[PDB]
Ligand binder design. Sequence first.
Ligand SMILES: O=C(O)Cc1cs/c(=N\C(=O)[C@@H]2CCN(S(=O)(=O)c3ccccc3)C2)n1O
Ligand SMILES: O=C(O)Cc1cs/c(=N\C(=O)[C@@H]2CCN(S(=O)(=O)c3ccccc3)C2)n1O
Ligand SMILES: [Zn+2]
Ligand SMILES: [Zn+2]
Lengths: 338, 338
Amino acid sequence: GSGEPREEAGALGPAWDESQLRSYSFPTRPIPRLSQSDPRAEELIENEEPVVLTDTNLVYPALKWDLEYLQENIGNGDFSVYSASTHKFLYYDEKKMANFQNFKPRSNREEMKFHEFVEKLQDIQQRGGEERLYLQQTLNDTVGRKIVMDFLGFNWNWINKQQGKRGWGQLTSNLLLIGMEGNVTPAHYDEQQNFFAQIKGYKRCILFPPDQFECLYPYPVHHPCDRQSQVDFDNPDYERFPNFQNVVGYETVVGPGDVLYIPMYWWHHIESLLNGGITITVNFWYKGAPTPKRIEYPLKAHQKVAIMRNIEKMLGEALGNPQEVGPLLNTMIKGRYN
Amino acid sequence: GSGEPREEAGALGPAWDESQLRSYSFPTRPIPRLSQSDPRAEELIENEEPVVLTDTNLVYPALKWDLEYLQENIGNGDFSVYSASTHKFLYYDEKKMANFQNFKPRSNREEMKFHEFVEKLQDIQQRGGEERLYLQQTLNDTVGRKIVMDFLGFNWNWINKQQGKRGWGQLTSNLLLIGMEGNVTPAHYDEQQNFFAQIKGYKRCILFPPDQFECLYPYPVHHPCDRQSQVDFDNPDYERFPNFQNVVGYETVVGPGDVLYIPMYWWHHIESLLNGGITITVNFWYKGAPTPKRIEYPLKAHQKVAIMRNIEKMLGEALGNPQEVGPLLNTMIKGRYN
Ligand SMILES: O=C(O)Cc1cs/c(=N\C(=O)[C@@H]2CCN(S(=O)(=O)c3ccccc3)C2)n1O
Ligand SMILES: O=C(O)Cc1cs/c(=N\C(=O)[C@@H]2CCN(S(=O)(=O)c3ccccc3)C2)n1O
Ligand SMILES: [Zn+2]
Ligand SMILES: [Zn+2]
């Protein structure tokens, strides 16, 4: 999967061991770890394939970040902090909750100050509780001068050259992620290009190419969990999701200084290693390049994914009610295309 | 189904008996036979429900038509004549035959003069052959003066008032249908409003409302047999088409002078009665009224049918190949909406 664990400099031991990885039913192949100066890494990014770049220095000034330094300097703004009773955080589109009245939400959001999230995490650790927290906040203007200086110290030269070379849209946001050990963001896909810059701790990243759509069974587009896989990776229901027995992933473990390119529409399952301490990540999201004027066949897998999304959307509007999308689609194919 | 057979005037016996009707697996209810002056008949047509009008005099001058009079006066143009080895005529869109290379056609068209079709039918009857023929030709300018006079004698006053009252488009064509006894046009639906004017002989008409789409399993839109039911009414495959066990039809027998309104998108199965002689029919097709500017919910069944047709069409163009429509639709719903 992730290969034999890397050895940290200065003979400080292995960065992790296989007992910090969760157990799943599918095989994986390693994502390549390359230098940013390696043309193989440019070839991968251009072909919209994942790659771990080891030496971008993208967030070099942020490698000194921890909770004390952040609490001291990140400012007095509000931070979105997500809770969870188990290791799996259950995200959902709150705007789409109206369409599914029989939807029980289980990972609630709560805005708080940074110093509150820090002492709330210290609250849990000593009381021995099993509640998990996950801070996920877009970096804004309300951060202190020191964080602004660190932010200005990012390798904007390298990443801006990446944005122009690939024809991507401009940077949409930076997401700061601080998570507890063992936290799991379940498999889902995003519609923007992602540079996943690891800062503190180690995160296991399992990626699935867009052509695995058939094996990962995303929720209906109108469901609050749109773009998330319905499959419970810890207890896969092979009767509902038989092609999950065919899924093959791409796996890597990113540590401080690593930058993982997650191509747009690629599924990713992200977990903070067991017993590995808190994790810190900053993401760089770019809107993908505009679709070519004339079409090249055969279509890319992510184009077919977008086609399916648009059919579901347009059908929900045409029928007036997203709940009728399913029965019409079954009416369309039953005994005609299946 | 069609009720007890009507008694012809002058004590000339029953117009038909139940032994001239084919045997099928589904129940039926009678289509109402009404006077054109009956408001119930106007209510049915306005609600796009079938009705048999008994006294339109729509094609009154044509009631004297037979093969001798037609051969004498219909002119020297070409007439499309369809052949068939069995009673079921297998029509298909020749333009869509490219998409389905593994399609074997079994009811071939052949253009000929009217006098040839007449003596070819006399050829078959005396040689005892089992080959069937079905003349289906749009009436054009190349018809003799006498047929023009008969055509001018149609009740244009009544039918034009119908066209304006319902907001329909203008008349698209008149189809002259001359068929042999026992001929069957299998179940299919049309996208225009139809006034089905019976002239000679009797035809059993079995209609299914558009909301029976699920029970009648039409071919893929890109298939040459688009808009036709895949179900063999003489040997229904309940394993492929389980909801055909739920279908209920509307049934009637039309004779000379009867006009059957077949509403747009209504399925119809039309058969010339066994041992009943040749049949003559003229159809009047009108494009339906333009769809209302703002939408009224819930949708009509035929609107959902049109929605499904457009998804299949647009998907075939987007993917570049109609053969990929099926697998993408299954990919879309398998384990997500089913
Ligand atoms: O725990 C982890 O490390 C894994 C993890 C935490 S958050 C996350 N992803 C996201 O938060 C967004 C939500 C929607 N998309 S988006 O449409 O591309 C977009 C991008 C920019 C602005 C708005 C929308 C990705 N991942 O994968
Ligand atoms: O044997 C019988 O009596 C039954 C029978 C014989 S032919 C027939 N139907 C048709 O020939 C057309 C083919 C396509 N449509 S259409 O889109 O509405 C249309 C209408 C006008 C111009 C062009 C297209 C109906 N039926 O039902
Ligand atoms: Zn994501
Ligand atoms: Zn028809």
